[PDB]
């Protein structure tokens, strides 16, 4: 475009063959790109343990011992929830 130089992160986004609607979302943060697919970012619940795929190799042993949620979003009773960076 008109801009001479662009950030690598922005450039990456620019290369995504998706609709504008999803592009905007992706940019914002409501959505992520992984394995050539777009899905909701992981949910981090208060007190519960995070997915084993996001923690460091040495943190998995301690993460596995934390409580786990095996219910639906409606049944979830977490005091606070947010997307995991």
């Amino acid at each position: 475009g008109h801009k001479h130089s662009e950030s690598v992160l922005q450039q990456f986004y620019n290369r995504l063959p998706v609709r504008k609607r999803f592009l905007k979302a992706i940019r914002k943060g409501t959505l992520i790109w992984d394995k050539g697919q777009v899905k909701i970012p992981p949910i981090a619940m208060q007190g519960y343990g995070l997915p084993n795929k996001l923690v460091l190799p040495h943190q998995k042993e301690f993460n596995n011992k934390l409580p786990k949620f095996k219910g639906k979003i409606n049944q979830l009773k977490a005091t606070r929830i947010w997307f995991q960076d």
Binding site: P17, V18, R19, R21, F22, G36, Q37, V38, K39
Partner: protein
């Protein structure tokens, strides 16, 4: 006219706690391909048929792409087209055989591909930029294109590609 299109996730459950959070289809539930109720006779598919011809040397391969994956099908087709499966393969020439594909409408796509996929067409010195066409339009208008483009982009980038 004044709002975003109705996606496939509008007609089903949402499960964020899973890989396939929502199922996607090229068409709505009420719009999916169907067969006419009065079958004048029942039919059976042969999967694939092959015709050899020693005299003219042109071979034919008729396939049934019913419920198959686009990628896999394309990959398979590429091989045949290229003619690499033969011993006497010459990259200089096109040593392949003719391939026929049917039931292209019945193809499948894993993940959120039906609702989060587009196709770009380059334009020579255009201010608006490349033309973007959604996959639902292509499915609605010409299903064959879905496979056609996958095969095309799979084939080597050379002067033989057209052939």
């Amino acid at each position: 006219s004044q709002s975003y299109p109705k996606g496939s996730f509008h007609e089903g459950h949402i499960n964020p706690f899973a890989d396939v959070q929502w199922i996607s289809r090229p068409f709505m539930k009420r719009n999916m391909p169907r067969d006419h109720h009065p079958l004048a006779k029942q039919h059976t598919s042969l999967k694939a048929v092959t015709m050899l011809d020693e005299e003219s040397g042109n071979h034919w391969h008729v396939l049934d792409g019913k419920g198959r994956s686009v990628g896999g099908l394309a990959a398979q087709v590429v091989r045949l087209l290229q003619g690499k499966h033969r011993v006497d393969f010459t990259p200089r020439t096109a040593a392949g055989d003719s391939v026929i594909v049917v039931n292209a409408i019945h193809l499948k796509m894993a993940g959120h591909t039906w609702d989060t996929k587009v196709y770009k067409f380059d334009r020579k010195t255009h201010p608006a930029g490349p033309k973007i066409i959604t996959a639902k339009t292509i499915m609605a208008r010409n299903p064959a294109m879905i496979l056609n483009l996958a095969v095309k982009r799979m084939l080597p980038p050379n002067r033989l590609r057209p052939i």
